[PDB]
Coordinates of C-alpha atoms in Angstrom, one line a residue:
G1 CA -28.3 4.2 3.5
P2 CA -25.2 6.1 5.0
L3 CA -24.2 9.4 3.2
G4 CA -20.9 7.7 2.4
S5 CA -17.4 9.3 2.1
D6 CA -14.9 10.1 -0.7
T7 CA -11.8 7.8 -1.1
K8 CA -8.3 8.8 -0.2
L9 CA -4.8 8.3 -1.5
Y10 CA -3.0 5.0 -1.2
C11 CA 0.5 5.3 0.3
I12 CA -0.1 5.4 4.0
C13 CA 2.4 8.2 3.5
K14 CA -0.4 10.5 2.7
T15 CA 0.4 10.6 -0.9
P16 CA -1.8 9.3 -4.0
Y17 CA -0.5 6.7 -6.4
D18 CA 2.3 7.6 -8.7
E19 CA 3.2 5.5 -11.8
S20 CA 6.6 7.0 -11.3
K21 CA 6.6 5.5 -7.9
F22 CA 6.1 1.7 -7.5
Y23 CA 3.9 0.0 -5.1
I24 CA 3.2 -3.2 -3.2
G25 CA -0.5 -4.1 -2.8
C26 CA -1.9 -4.9 0.5
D27 CA -2.6 -8.6 0.1
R28 CA -5.5 -8.2 2.2
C29 CA -5.9 -4.4 2.4
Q30 CA -6.2 -4.0 -1.5
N31 CA -3.9 -0.8 -1.2
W32 CA -0.7 0.3 -2.6
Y33 CA 2.1 2.4 -1.1
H34 CA 5.5 3.5 -2.5
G35 CA 8.1 1.0 -1.2
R36 CA 9.6 3.5 1.3
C37 CA 6.2 4.8 1.7
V38 CA 5.9 2.0 4.3
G39 CA 9.6 1.4 4.9
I40 CA 10.3 -1.4 2.5
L41 CA 13.0 -2.4 0.1
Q42 CA 12.9 -1.4 -3.5
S43 CA 13.4 -4.8 -4.6
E44 CA 10.7 -5.8 -2.2
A45 CA 8.7 -4.3 -5.1
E46 CA 10.0 -6.7 -7.8
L47 CA 11.1 -9.9 -5.7
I48 CA 7.7 -9.6 -4.3
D49 CA 4.5 -11.7 -4.8
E50 CA 3.1 -12.1 -1.4
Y51 CA 3.8 -8.9 0.3
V52 CA 1.2 -7.5 2.5
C53 CA 0.3 -4.0 3.6
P54 CA 1.1 -2.8 7.0
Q55 CA -2.5 -1.5 7.6
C56 CA -3.6 -5.0 6.7
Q57 CA -1.8 -6.6 9.5
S58 CA -4.0 -4.5 11.8
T59 CA -6.9 -6.2 10.2
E60 CA -5.3 -9.7 9.7
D61 CA -5.5 -10.6 13.4
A62 CA -5.8 -9.3 16.9

């Protein structure tokens, strides 16, 4: 029964979610970062429906 730990912001850019800002959800890392938060297109936000998080890729495979 580990003590556990509080959660953190989403954008790997050390910044919590912002409805003003748009995100792309880690297909496998269930997380959201401002488009540029990870260095992505703006459109990558809209024309997207299979985008994956960058932290996810680390978990994807070795």
